[model samples]
Target: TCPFYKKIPGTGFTVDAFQYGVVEGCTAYFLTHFHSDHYAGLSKHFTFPVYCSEITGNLLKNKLHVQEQYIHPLPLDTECIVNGVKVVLLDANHCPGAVMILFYLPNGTVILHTGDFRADPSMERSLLADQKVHMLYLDTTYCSPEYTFPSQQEVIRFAINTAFEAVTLNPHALVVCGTYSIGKEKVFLAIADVLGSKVGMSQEKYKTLQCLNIPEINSLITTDMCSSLVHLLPMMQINFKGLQSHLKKCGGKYNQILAFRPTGWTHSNKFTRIADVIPQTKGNISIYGIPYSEHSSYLEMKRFVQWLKPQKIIPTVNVGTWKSRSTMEKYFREWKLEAGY
Candidate 1:
């Protein structure tokens, strides 16, 4: 349900483990990003020193209402001395403020903590291949062969074309986007720019974007519901009943709703083209589950594992039950063997 329990192996610091009681040796707290799952137990009342990226710092302070004094922002790709140890924040390619933490401890060991990430080629430059990492805390969310999906760019392209196609097919049809507070923004921005349409967003989302400092999306927001042809709603609203109520509120400006629900688990087969992925349509509501994942695919993770060849690989997700843990161990064994390190 959550990451490998809060405490890191040797460091006196904890990552995303605020829900539990006070950690014994924790001197500093860390949050990789502002997603709810990552910061599950963090509350406004937390007084402990917290460390994260600047954009995520704003989200934690502004959205979660965590006090500003406890929040500390770190720069990317730069080494900073925290607790007399070298710590570097590198782009995670997951979300705006997400990062993969690189730590160089005083005991001649390196620890790389990947909060949640999709592998990118650019990581080769930043991953410090010269130094062999002692412990690698990896995101194993899709560490299985069956979870392979299309790339982020491919999915975004499909989303833009599909949304645009809907508009041209029926001008009165409203494009309803299913989104997270800080995810799938690229798909929404691309479709809006191509169509030259404003987006209807809730006040909470508007304020969140302001914190995110995305000028492109910040400028196109309309608080007025019927003012924009494209609307950004919560992910759950992609269902038939939710879409119907939203369409009714449009005051007859739109008759049918085209919902684009983008998530990683939506589609699995790489052979399945984006166009061929079927849409679930019920009369006036059409919902498309687009494959847009921020987590690395099975092949990407294997390569990442091979490249780093860390002394130890810790499975961070899908380890709650022994069955899942056993499968994870088997995969780890195979990856290590294939790595030939």
Candidate 2:
């Protein structure tokens, strides 16, 4: 069953559904995270305060241009009252400022809304502690068994090694790491740090990085582009023609472009636990398809479901796609069996 964003059950709370206009009985607006897809429907016209992580508030202001007055910034792991309902934020482990929304309704329901997260070991503390969650709003991006992949840290090391190998062969090998506005900053930053190279990103991205509190980020950036081989380009600009155009501007300072296009959609075959999917080589441009996903893999999701053992699991993704939802539901049944009654 769909957990309607328009108005969450047992409360007058609307979440991440601003495009459809205000909910009829809405008393509070909760933002799960700062991802564009989550905030896709935001408007400059709304009067209510949009509650979000303090970090998310900055990006919402600096990136999306949301009004500062209407933005409500909250700290992590602290319980706060919103329209008489207890609410708190948890580190979602997806990206900087990403959080899982927890709601404690008057009806004794403890609902956990996982915006987009990985069941990373970095969250060493028990997520729920001794308290059991009533309902779990899951990020169903990688629900199928085939969606399993390596951890973020492990996958990141692989990227560092890959970049290191490329740089050793061609000291001037231009490293172009493709990323979205908010996500995948860690990948490029780690690679650049290990290689001891500077990163060239848009001035807008530079401003966004300042808000994330990532140390030594400024040291890796240069005001000028030509000085650095490590470049952070938007996901849309990872194409061959796009790379060719950007490379031309560098004045041939580097030889052979090693562009990394990382995403969860990198592999999907009946095969091994962790397969090495080679990059596509095309005339000096080599595109490595890294299986780097922010979302929890199928195996991770199982661990989460087993640990929390929530009474209900409501998928945030593939809600509209009935076929996809059906398959996810099937998987949940298998996971539930392992979790036990």
Candidate 3:
């Protein structure tokens, strides 16, 4: 099954993989991120050899529970051959395991696949350092210039402010925030760092986070752990009644529970209602609404595409429909000269 973009002709093919039947007889697959769009239906086709960065490979092995026979790991800024195609991994800043893959064919044709990415300073630095991209396939998920987003640091600050406000209002509440299993851990770290604390992790994530090798994020229960600090911890599994009981129990242990929320969370509707619905005592808990996002906004995508200067700028990830063709076309025209030299 071809997962993303146009379906493959016979058996399967996809934007995430380069598939061909009998023309060359060499089959190889590469992935740019761990997102469902990129990895979905991946296991069905690439039973031979699939290529991705070490982090992404680990994600498939550890998280997705994919078999080891098909998964192949590659390091950053290096080249390797899988089923006769040369591949390399470049740094993409959208997520921790996100990557930009480059493919070199036997016929000297080179293709650069810019997977889901955000145009940040780090991304710029990496792209500038790489000067060998030919026939670039850009990621124009947000091709229009109208979309804009704050920096990662800015969003982290907003989340922390929300947490602090909650603590000030209620002294004995424990907050729980929803986040993905991977890549989103940085948000937790940011919150903990603000309060000079770290999130307590389960044995699984504890081991996984350690493998990340960030160096600064000491576990919450380190040998020299400090008592006076804020910390992030995995959300305890709790239903409505369980949450209320947990909050009531936290009264003697902590002052307040400030949960860091996900993107687009509104305080008035979600947090307020949640506090009311939960069985915790009145004024015992508070909820905060903070705005943050994982995907790049429209304007950021435009800037990133402009920097790449691809011969053909195609936006297919988000607006994958004939109805949205005109919208993407208008965006490309406005920014045509910006990236094209």
Candidate 4:
């Protein structure tokens, strides 16, 4: 959706979900991951040929309600060509389902589209070790070092310890942690493992995780099993009033209620905006936060772009606002880089 690139119109290529229109060029459209921003318009709009990895393909088709016929499943590190454009999908370790795509064209140009990544050595080392990439469509979601993140291990430890403390204080209390159906199994598993308890999931989530063969982390009980199950709501539902009311229903039945969100001490301006919208305006429920992020920090984003040595660094996500824009510019200036397109 940036100025440097061309995209299929009305396909929500510039928007979110809801397919706007079908693309004309039929060679290939690579879906890096199942994230909403990356493939929002594809379901209805992209009736034509498409490509994605096996993990994402099954997730989109079975879970997200997209079809399999439109996809050409490719795994990580495997190179394939359609219309002479060599492509490779790398394991984007930011999330369980995340992937980064690299395009090598015969015209002596290379393009890397990191569909939101992290500084994970597994993914970062692979990119740094590769050579001669010309143009990199980098992930600058966290292009500033100020967006420092705690380690995944640290987050896991916090969730487990907190849940345990709450449960021990009130043995019969319900402990619910929020997680995502698409990604975030790691957090869920860490909570369950640390608490030495079972996590619950919906039938839909079970099928999706099953396809990925991540059974160790799929032991979540469904909501119907609440007689003994603790709820772990997805992060998206934190703002839903109805869901909150539902959680309150169990307050009397359970001695204590613990809800875990992967948002810790580092509060962003965006969080403040949401806080302003609370209707009650005075007394509110104690909403817990556990800091977790799917994308790299601003500095991590800048480093990745610099490593690519691309002709341009274009900001996509998290750059639409004025404050984020200034923050991005300041970060790039320190790296002796300028934004183009």
Ranked by lDDT, the better of candidates 1 and 4 is 1
Clashing pairs in 3: 147-299, 171-255, 171-256, 172-255, 173-257, 199-232
- Worst 10-residue lDDT window for candidate 2 reads 266-275
lDDT of 3 by residue, 173-264 (tens): 44555444456666666666555555654466655565453666565423221343343334443234444565464346765454544543
Give a tens-digit lDDT track for model 2, residues 1-341.
Answer: 21464357988877777666666777777887777777877766668779989888888787777888999999898888987888888999888888888888898889888888887554546446747788888888878877767766777887888889988988878999887767777788788888887888888777888777677667878656766768988889898898888888888687678888777744553453333656778898988777778888778878877877789988888788889988988988888887684
Local error of candidate 3 at residue 92 (angstroms):
0.9
Q: What C-alpha lDDT, on a 0 to 100 scale, does residue 317 get in candidate 2?
A: 84
The model with the greater TM-score, 1 or 2, is 1
TM-scores, all models, native as reference: 0.95, 0.92, 0.73, 0.78
Candidate 4 worst ten-residue window by lDDT: 8-17
Please list the residue runs of candidate 2 whose C-alpha ends up more than 4 Å from where it truly belongs after superposition: 1-6, 121-124, 268-275
- Model 3 TM-score, all chains together: 0.73
What would the TM-score be for candidate 1 when compared with the true structure?
Answer: 0.95
State in Å the error of residue 322, model 1.
1.5
Better of 2 and 4 by TM-score: 2
Provide the overall lDDT of each model, using Cα atoms, as 2-decimal numbers. Answer: 0.82, 0.79, 0.56, 0.59
